[PDB]
Amino acid sequence: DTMKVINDPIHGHIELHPLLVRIIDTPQFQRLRYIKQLGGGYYVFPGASHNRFEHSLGVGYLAGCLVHALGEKQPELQISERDVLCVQIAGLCRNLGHGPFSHMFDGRFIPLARPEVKWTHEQGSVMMFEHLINSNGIKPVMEQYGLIPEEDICFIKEQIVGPLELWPYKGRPENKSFLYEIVSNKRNGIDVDKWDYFARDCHHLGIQNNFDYKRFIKFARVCEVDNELRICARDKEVGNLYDMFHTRNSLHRRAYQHKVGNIIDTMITDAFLKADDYIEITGAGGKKYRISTAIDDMEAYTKLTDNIFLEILYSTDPKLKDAREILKQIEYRNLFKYVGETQPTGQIKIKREDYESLPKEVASAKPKVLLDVKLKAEDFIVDVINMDYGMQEKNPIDHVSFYCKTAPNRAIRITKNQVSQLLPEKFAEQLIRVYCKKVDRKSLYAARQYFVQWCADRNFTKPQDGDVIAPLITPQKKEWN
Amino acid sequence: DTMKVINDPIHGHIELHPLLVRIIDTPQFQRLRYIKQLGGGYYVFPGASHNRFEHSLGVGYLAGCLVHALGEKQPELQISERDVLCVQIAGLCRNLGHGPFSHMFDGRFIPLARPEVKWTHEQGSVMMFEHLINSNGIKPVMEQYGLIPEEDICFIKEQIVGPLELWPYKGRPENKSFLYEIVSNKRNGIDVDKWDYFARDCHHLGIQNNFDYKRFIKFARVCEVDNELRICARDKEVGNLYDMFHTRNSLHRRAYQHKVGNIIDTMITDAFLKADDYIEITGAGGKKYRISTAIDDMEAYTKLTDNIFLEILYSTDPKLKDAREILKQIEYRNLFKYVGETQPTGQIKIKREDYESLPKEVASAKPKVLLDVKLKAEDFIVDVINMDYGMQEKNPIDHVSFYCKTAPNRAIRITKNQVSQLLPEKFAEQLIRVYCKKVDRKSLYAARQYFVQWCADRNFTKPQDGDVIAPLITPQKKEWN
Amino acid sequence: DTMKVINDPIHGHIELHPLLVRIIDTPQFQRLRYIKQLGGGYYVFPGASHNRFEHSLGVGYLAGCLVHALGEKQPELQISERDVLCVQIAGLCRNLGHGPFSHMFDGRFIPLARPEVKWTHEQGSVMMFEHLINSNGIKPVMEQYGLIPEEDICFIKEQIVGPLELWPYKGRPENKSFLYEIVSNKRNGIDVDKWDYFARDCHHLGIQNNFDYKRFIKFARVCEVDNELRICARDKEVGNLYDMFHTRNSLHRRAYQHKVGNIIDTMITDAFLKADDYIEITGAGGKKYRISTAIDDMEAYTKLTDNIFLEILYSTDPKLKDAREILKQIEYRNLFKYVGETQPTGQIKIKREDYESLPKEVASAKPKVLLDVKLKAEDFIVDVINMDYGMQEKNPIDHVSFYCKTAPNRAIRITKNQVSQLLPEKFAEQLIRVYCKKVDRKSLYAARQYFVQWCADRNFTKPQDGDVIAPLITPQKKEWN
Amino acid sequence: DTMKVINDPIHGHIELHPLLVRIIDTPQFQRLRYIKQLGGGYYVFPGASHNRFEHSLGVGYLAGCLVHALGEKQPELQISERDVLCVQIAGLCRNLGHGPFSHMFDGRFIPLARPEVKWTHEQGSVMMFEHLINSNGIKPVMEQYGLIPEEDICFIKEQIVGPLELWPYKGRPENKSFLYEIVSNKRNGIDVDKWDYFARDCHHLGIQNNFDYKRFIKFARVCEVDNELRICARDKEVGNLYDMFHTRNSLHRRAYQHKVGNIIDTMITDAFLKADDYIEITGAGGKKYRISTAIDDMEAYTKLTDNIFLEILYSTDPKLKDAREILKQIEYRNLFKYVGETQPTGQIKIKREDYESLPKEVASAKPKVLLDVKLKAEDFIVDVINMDYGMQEKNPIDHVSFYCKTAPNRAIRITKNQVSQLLPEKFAEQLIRVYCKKVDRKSLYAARQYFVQWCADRNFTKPQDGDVIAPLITPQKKEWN
Ligand SMILES: Nc1ncnc2c1ncn2[C@H]1C[C@H](O)[C@@H](COP(=O)(O)OP(=O)(O)OP(=O)(O)O)O1
Ligand SMILES: Nc1ncnc2c1ncn2[C@H]1C[C@H](O)[C@@H](COP(=O)(O)OP(=O)(O)OP(=O)(O)O)O1
Ligand SMILES: Nc1ncnc2c1ncn2[C@H]1C[C@H](O)[C@@H](COP(=O)(O)OP(=O)(O)OP(=O)(O)O)O1
Ligand SMILES: Nc1ncnc2c1ncn2[C@H]1C[C@H](O)[C@@H](COP(=O)(O)OP(=O)(O)OP(=O)(O)O)O1
Ligand SMILES: [Mg+2]
Ligand SMILES: [Mg+2]
Ligand code: NA
Ligand code: NA
16 A cells, blocks of 8 residues: 655655554544644744644654664564554654644643643543544554554553553553653653654754754663663763753743743633633534533534634624734734743742732832832733753653663663763742733833832842843842842 | 844844834734645645745845845945835735735636636735735834835835836836846846745755855846846856756746645635635625635735635535535545646647646547546546746746956846756746546546547657556557557 | 764764774775865865765765665565675775875876876775775675675675676676666666765755755665666656756756866876876885876875875975975965856867867967967866766666556656656766966956957857957857857 | 855855955965864764864854944944954964864873973964964055054954953954954853854764854844943843853763764874974974974974874884874774763862873772783873863853843843753863773773772762673762662
8 A cells, every 4th residue: 555755844754654644634633734833932933833733743753763763773672563553653643632822722721711620732632532533433444454453542542641540551561661651751751752843843943953863762772670671871872861851941941931922822812711702613413612612522622723813813793802802912913011030039939829819919019119100910910930851840860761881781870960060950940921911111111110029029039131120129139239 | 223133944033124023013914824835735745834924024034135235245326225125125025915825826716716807916915015004004104214105115016016007117217227126026037035935945845955045145246238227147157047947947846836736726726616605704894705806805805814724624504515525525635636647749838728628638538448437527637737937938047147257347148058058948848737536446547548548649748657557558659669 | 793873964873884894994994084075176165175984984874775775665675684784885985996186086187197097986996995805804704794705795896896897797696686776876877976975065065955865765666677676766756866967967067167176176186297206105015106106006005195285285305396386376376267168069079189289279269359478388278078967978867767656566767758848958068168377467368369269260159258358259250149 | 356255064155355365375374274173073073074274264254244243233333344354364363373183282282292381272373373474475465455464463363362461452442342252252252263163063073053143143232341342142142142151061072072082182192292203394494393393483383284194194214103003003993992981079179280190090999809900000091171161160151241122232240040040050070081001801891990999989970880880899889879
């Protein structure tokens, strides 16, 4: 039949097995063509027009590359073609659950629209995968190419979301444990999904990538660590791994957490919230769902993409006026205004349940400056951003196993001081951005005074531009000089 | 003010004048974010997710680069800042008139939906530009930055569409004639729009570009040719100019005229035709327009983007069933089947008014093979493609002026035989692709027999796979050996 | 053992089998570090610092890629690991015979220094390979890794130089015929050596490469053609193959035949000729050789690299004064002056044995202008350059075999008219460059008059700048208008 | 006059002022074609064939870019074309002083050959520049283009080496202080030399660069800081500046301090030391100089390049046997063996004058294992490497001035806690590599035991492979856990 060839600008010419083609040529997978990888990021980086679809192809490709390379170097692992196909399918399908504008949907909209429910793209991907399989008669195709659907569907879902409940997985046994480290690596965060987005996002954003995934593959091996088979890196590659996470952090600082990209995501979310009572999406049995409830029905969710943005923008319904107007403001670039950024000092850390009280706190600050306008809580947005190396406070290199040239089957551990004094001492921090919904010059001036006063009151760090934006407030603080 | 800086993956960090920002931050310009540069090509090249918006920024940037470079080298041209801004604005806005899926709209849909009307993206761009200016109070902003709206609006439109009726232009006089060669060069086709799409399309398609626009700029000069000031290239760069057009032709062969991309464009066009009576788009004064009539009202046209595809795909109306079903077949990748490709021999050239007669001709061919299914005219699609070097049958290098190192103010001509014997003897040709709407094995086999027989009957070239797909037909033709 | 891994900027991370490492770590191979790929080109393109060593690694790598790919797709070919190693070794070693400044040595110096002898880099490579094997005890290492030295040494040499004299090869039989098409393809010129230098030269020159060798590999198959197994390309890739040779021609026009790079090569050759009686190189048994006789003894030739240039430049011997002075003039950029370029028309073609008569012919021309300086034959240099598609007058695509999607084991042929009307009508031409050794403005003016007059007298093409450089000469010629 | 245009693979098409061309076309500048940028690095990274010449062109080009950009944005700085040319010349000429194999010469050879003298490439560059000017009649050419030689030669030398003896410079006054921050920035290390080598080294090494110099230029301004005009960065670019130094550190870890590249540099240095009594280089007045004394005479130093390596390698003099043999071992890849790497803990820091005592210390360690070979001090090499952010222990961002968007003429300071907790806590460290000159298996095993024992005895960090290479030694140390 067909090994189809696909030309990808990041990976070049990729071969797709006919079973992968069958999965790809479905409304559930093709849907990813209409969901932007970086959401609101496109509105700041005009190169970032790329969608989840092409990222998914790349993830499936790299998953295949890594499992093949391991199998060629270590025939004793007994990786079968069936294993390779299952890993490729998981790599291909791990983005199926994303919603309009990607992280905006799961990171901002759903938590506000449906605070009671716990929703992740991972869960969505498993549900959509099930829907894809059942709606398109995939199971007989899997059997035709040597898969065993019961075991292998389970294995694929487990790769995506983790244990579907002592060895906790049912899709494959402990001697194939390393296969769970490829698509979504919950142990240390080194997975093929990161490798594709590093390369792809960089190519589109116009920022250059310093991580070499092909080198890592060449140096990768499977070793026994604590009775378990794990993918291990060559010892001397440790520096490269530190750099990989540094790259990830840089991408988040420069692009994914860009202050204006975040505010555009915030405005789109607001628009969706105001549209939520009036947009109807037809799901299974002709039932109607909302933007916020399409996650409950996969048939409906299949039709929930970036197009919602344009449905609202182009609407004529008076009911959608408020939602439509917010999107129109985005088009005119009448954005909420960035006021500034600060961080907590020392051990002190800000709990999630306090986020809603923060705009009130800013509005309550009493700056000794003459102000013609005074602002209220609702005029402020406070966006708290948790930046880490993927494992909260932990160093993921403490969770990585290495091997040495002289004994390639012997796994070892490497600690931070065995590497460099010039590495991060901490692996998590919080950034606090403040914005003002009132966009006029007088309001922005006032907002800067409240903000810097609030920072001083909370003993947060001095904003970078603090002496310029609030010259009358910054002298009060001793610690700021 | 101060400039905005925009990071573009092709051009890096670009400066935008505040007037350009004002023009960009409008619904008329932001619309271009929702129109794919390569239309159906995305469905073949997954990297080609890029939209007309980012291309437009690039064109505006390069227009500025060229006019600046000329002014720095030749102060005697008297290029003013006003001229630079007008050239940038034209470059920025020359894509405003594109419709859903770009060339699909003006190349396929409108000629079928509205055969009586003459429509071009150029005309559309002028109409949209006027609408953009008038709807957003741009004229006072132009005066603020030293533009004279009456003259300069005229100049910008003329750059986009050409003479609005010897010297035929009103926006600038003959001593600034060279300025009309930058954004859309009607004399020879060497303009900045090509330079951006060569680099941008290549970056996204995953194909590399051989043309160096920065070299060309470095060697560009303005000289008097026939009492007119024109942009001239250095003599020895002639090979590079031939190569530029070769690059353009290669991009068309490999990507823009890809056989499956074209059939996807064809299917989308069919879907739009079937949807045309039922999709309603609200224009000026609340009036309703169709997909095919939105070009008559710019307010309506502003809201006509790629989104139409998703509106149809997600529709529930039984009236839209036929349109919706076509798009669903695209998603399942049930595409019309490629039968093959042929070309005319010699003097024979196929007129546009004969395109409709061609499917009938294929169905009329009488292959001497026993056939279980016979096919009708409507089961065939015949797609005729005109490939040239941008000036129909002419060599555009015959319309280029050069200068020599020893006399940089003296314009000269170079003929083909002064360059190389290894160049094309002709500069235009036609490709004929045939597809079959019936997708089953028996029908496809039959379609191949009719096709090859038709080629033989018309003394078209032997299809490349002719001996394999029609082993019983190919021996009859003497000419094919 | 395990592989060494080498990071190459063109190909990334390359694995080298330990036998290849043994071959590489020898004075005969390491020698290639001291020989510039593009010779005098470095003096025009400052990026072109790259040497034959890294090019050789790339060729060996790509040879391995192609043979592996073929073997994986078609197990029935019976490609063994022994075959893969032999192909890699041939790819690695096919550059061993190059001399100082690469093509300058075999293309310019040796034919002038030793007109009686017939010498090629290919012959040199075979001799050096033999010397490498024998001097470094490689044969037992070959046996250790499963090679059979007698048969396999023969096979490797045959890949490099062709038949060492009905099936003409002894290293492998007709059922492995396709293996001879990989490293140096005598049938059509599509080999891995071209693919490495396209990518590498482009990377260093600062000119971008439009040929995708990875796509070619993906579409390559072995089919029976006229009782012989040959590498065949997919039908629809024919355009890409035409483009590959177009790319080669463009690299020669822009870079390898750069007019000043050629004149620098010419000057270096002159310097070597003047140094040849006095530089001594110690060879086998302590015998002394000349630059021109080092090719007779491999031990001596091992020590003959670009260093010769610096030995001359840094010399103090009065005997080397004339040679040294030429090189000093190169450093001051006192080069021979470019006068112009022309080509023959029609039947006329210029034979190698006429090259020496050409400067006399230019000096003999009688331009009707009063001239204050007159020049002699020795003041002129005439450089004749043969540009073709690698097979003299032939179209190498007439020597390529293809397959179609519907019958992948069935080889077919494709003619020029089955492809495009926009292709070259001829596949060979000659370029004639004229230079003047007298650099002053009066002499250069005179040289231009003689040159254009000579062109007219011989009915050569009109020089591009002819109307500017010789305004009194060009009107006499009818055919120039 | 008109510019020469040069095509550079990093920067594309560069314009060179005719005075720059005059400087470039001299034996003193052309010499840099024969000195490899990365020295022994080429023997590890085969892409790193690049020489100091092309790097110098790039530095001159970027120096020009930065000074032009500042002048265009801030006309009030009064930057003249004279200033631009002087900055370009300094940028062009700041690499003139490098010796064979670049850092090997000043970093390893001269300190061992001539411990009494203090020599730097900077000092060498000033001396060579003076020699270049005087030997080639450059001063009249400078006057012709509007330079004032006395003042401007002084200015150029000051940019290269710093104050030639309160404002300490004589070439320009305090109101042009910012001009001293461009070519070699002693205040904070942000200069154009780094920018060129980041891009160029990465391009050739096959490692990707994450620093965007064009972005920095776009955001750069000159502001008053402490009565002095200095180049300032936009506040929010601070992360990018931290990253610039991170990039520099990564290039040193991965490439410039590569353990095998360093040992090759060490072996070449040993060969030069053994050759030093016998190589003669003819300098001014026919006087003879040694490799170690050519730095005393510029005429001699002009002829001291990488060629020395080949002169030794190809020599027949019995006196050069020992030097020649070392180079031959490099060719066979019989290198000294890497034993391992460690670092000091805490306060402990190792002074340069202690380096000689270190091999003795390793040999003195008493590992409690029966060993069949014992090794002596001369069998060990200990290489101590100082890694910092360019300012020893200091954070160079503490020496950078920033501006904010709302007050672009007001300079501010940013402290480390105002940026991120995820940054380095220390900015300097030492790496200690140990190698063994005895290459046999028994000796290497013994060397590993001495090494790890020494680490334990000195409370240095545990070697990464310590548990594998010295399983009997590592358990004794408490702190290694
Ligand atoms: N000449 C080319 N260079 C680079 N990419 C190309 C070229 N031609 C096509 N592609 C891209 C488009 C697709 O992403 C991928 C496969 O295209 P192509 O090989 O034409 O497949 P196809 O499915 O249309 O052909 P068939 O089914 O006839 O093999 O390569
Ligand atoms: N660190 C970075 N590297 C590359 N591109 C970046 C980086 N940071 C932002 N960009 C991109 C996004 C935009 O396309 C362009 C400008 O962004 P940026 O300088 O952040 O503008 P801004 O409008 O957010 O800043 P302000 O208005 O504060 O000057 O640069
Ligand atoms: N961090 C890196 N990134 C990219 N290339 C590198 C890196 N470090 C080294 N290289 C290059 C240098 C060589 O071209 C190739 C192999 O280097 P490296 O793996 O360090 O080999 P090695 O021979 O020194 O290690 P060992 O023998 O200890 O495995 O990759
Ligand atoms: N077609 C090309 N594409 C890219 N770079 C080129 C090309 N031709 C030449 N170069 C490079 C080589 C040099 O680095 C730089 C200048 O080359 P070129 O323009 O041919 O200078 P030149 O000095 O020979 O011409 P002249 O003196 O006749 O103007 O550009
Ligand atoms: Mg995106
Ligand atoms: Mg597109
Ligand atoms: Na693509
Ligand atoms: Na180098």
